[PDB]
Amino acid sequence: HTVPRIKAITSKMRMPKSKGATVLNLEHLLEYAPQQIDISNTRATQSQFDTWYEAVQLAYDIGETEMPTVMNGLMVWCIENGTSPNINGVWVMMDGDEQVEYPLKPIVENAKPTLRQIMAHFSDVAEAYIEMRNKKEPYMPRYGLVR
Amino acid sequence: HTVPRIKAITSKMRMPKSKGATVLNLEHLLEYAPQQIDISNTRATQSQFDTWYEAVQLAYDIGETEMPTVMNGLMVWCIENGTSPNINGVWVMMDGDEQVEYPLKPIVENAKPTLRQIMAHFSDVAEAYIEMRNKKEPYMPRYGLVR
Amino acid sequence: LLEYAPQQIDISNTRATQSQFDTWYEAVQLAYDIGETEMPTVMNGLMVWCIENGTSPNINGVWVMMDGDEQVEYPLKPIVENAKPTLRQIMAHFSDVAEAYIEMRNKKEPYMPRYGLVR
Amino acid sequence: HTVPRIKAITSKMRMPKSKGATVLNLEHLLEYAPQQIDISNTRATQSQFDTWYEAVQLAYDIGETEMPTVMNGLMVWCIENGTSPNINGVWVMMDGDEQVEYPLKPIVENAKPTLRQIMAHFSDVAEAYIEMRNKKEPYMPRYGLVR
Amino acid sequence: HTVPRIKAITSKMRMPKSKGATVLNLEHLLEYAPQQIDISNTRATQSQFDTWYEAVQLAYDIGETEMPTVMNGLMVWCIENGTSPNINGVWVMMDGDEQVEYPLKPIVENAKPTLRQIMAHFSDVAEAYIEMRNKKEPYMPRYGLVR
């Protein structure tokens, strides 16, 4: 009478075993549902990102409220330009009609494992930023996304 | 009258012979029916898997009940990412909204003949895990299965 | 010449010579250091292991035979080595038994091997 | 019926023989499983290390509880700098914001066969120390490890 | 009718001749089938090995039953380390958690033509010893085999 429903884990599926016991905790494996970007190696670890963030803030010698504005310009600068730039150089943020100079050594250095992975944390914001700008001008960046 | 039934081994089939005697024990060959994954070289040997399992547990210096939870995260981390990662790196397991860091040297090393073969022991569980997650989100991993 | 009617597998170079096969057989038995009655059971597992896997495996490795729910380890160096001219030709002696073994197993499960036959 | 199991030592393997008798005690050879770092010549012998340890402690004329703190600084000083320094010099340990001077003659001398081999006893601790520091700053030493 | 069988030595093969007579005793040449390791110069002669064996035993001044245990440790010490070590040094054998010191001068000296050739007598046992240890740990020696 009852229409059967199949389980996710059957009693026929071979679990990995070591010394006669299973090596996976299935009571918690089904519950364990992380996000695909939190456990991907294409993104720098949060410990590495916070290591980079306060290392750049201390190198630039700026406060905690001035720091987010720098990241706004650094994200946009990383949209037009690449994530493998010259370490002995500068990156520019606009203050209206006046360019503002920042050394590129504190940024390329202290970014582990790679600036690409550190900059990949801005990918969701970067995509939204381009689409907003693309709605008012033929904006297309030379070097892909911030990733 | 009787409808004949053909034997599996006829008296006309050439057995391998050495010094006049057959080299195969046919009395036990028909009974011998192993599983295709237990005698395949695409999977690491159980002796090698147990060698890897206690070598990782001892390197991480954790108990026997905490160990299965690590393998739950390591399997999922091996779904999104590959089985040939940087040995000088870390792999991440989520504890809710906080990443947990584990060295990737005890994992890539001590896995013989290859991490792929060691990780291939999770293939049946890995396929079920994706299909369960794929039923609630467009989940697709960059690097295939755990194999 | 008219009387001379050999079998097509006894004079084919896709199969190792009987002198070479017996050279391989006692060379593997002596290397494994096992008796004459235990030896055929090893060949039963080695044939099946050569159905799922290939005949060009890593010489620095092992091949597995099942003892129920326990794997049994055998070095693959005495097998790949001492097999002349090639393990393929040495293993080709099991082709008739290998075909029958698969068809028997295929009658109870969707059994299909990655690496063809034992040949 | 029985699936054979191969012995580690077969009755066909040529043992080294002198005057008709074997030169290896096989009853104890299988049991004899030392650690690869206890019988390696890249590490100074324990007799040599203890010879160096009390020779440095006596030369510095310090107690037994003050001595371990000196080795903490000497290990770190041997991470940034090499293990072949000038014997007519000093090595520095920090006491906060004040450098502390120690002669380098009692260290380079009395270390047999080489300071490198004597300092190689700290390799496991040295690797852990760098990885701990590398998690909070881009720490990389000029002269490799303490080895 | 008879299918011919070819001889190993035909009546057309040029034998080496001196003064009209052959220089090889073919009646015994076919029977003469030595082992490839007994007549190879990569291995020290048995006369040289026994010369080395009792020369080391007499130098160490130990009995005939204590001697095989020393060779067990010396073989393993020659797996991790090389066969060209400093003659003015020591080699270590483990007694559990206590190193045991042996001079390396009686070993490097009295070994003719070379310690390598003298130590090559342990090659078969050395290969088996590593494979046994490699089944329980990622054991790999710096300096190849005992050869």
Author numbering:
A (entry chain Ar), B (entry chain As), D (entry chain Aq), E (entry chain Aa): 42 to 188
C (entry chain Ad): 70 to 188
Please share excerpts from the published article on this structure.
To prevent encapsidation of ssRNA, we further truncated the C-terminus, excluding 60 C-terminal residues (CPΔC60) containing both the C-IDR and the α8-helix, which is placed opposite to the RNA-binding loop and forms part of the RNA-binding cleft. This indeed led to formation of RNA-free filaments. Interestingly, the filaments had monomorphic helical architecture, VLPΔC60:h, with unique helical parameters. Because we found that 19 C-terminal residues of this construct, including those of the α7-helix, were not defined by cryo-EM density, we prepared another deletion mutant, CPΔC79, excluding these residues. The disrupted RNA-binding cleft in CPΔC60/CPΔC79 thus lost the ability to bind RNA, and consequently the RNA-binding loop S125-G130 adopted the conformation found in the RNA-free filaments VLPh and in VLPr. On the other hand, the fold of the N-IDR in CPΔC60/CPΔC79 resembled that found in RNA-encapsidating filaments, consistent with the CP-CP distances along the VLPΔC79:h filament being closer to VLPh+RNA than to VLPh. Thus, disruption of the RNA-binding cleft by large truncation of the C-terminal part of CP prevents RNA binding and also leads to the formation of monomorphic VLPs.
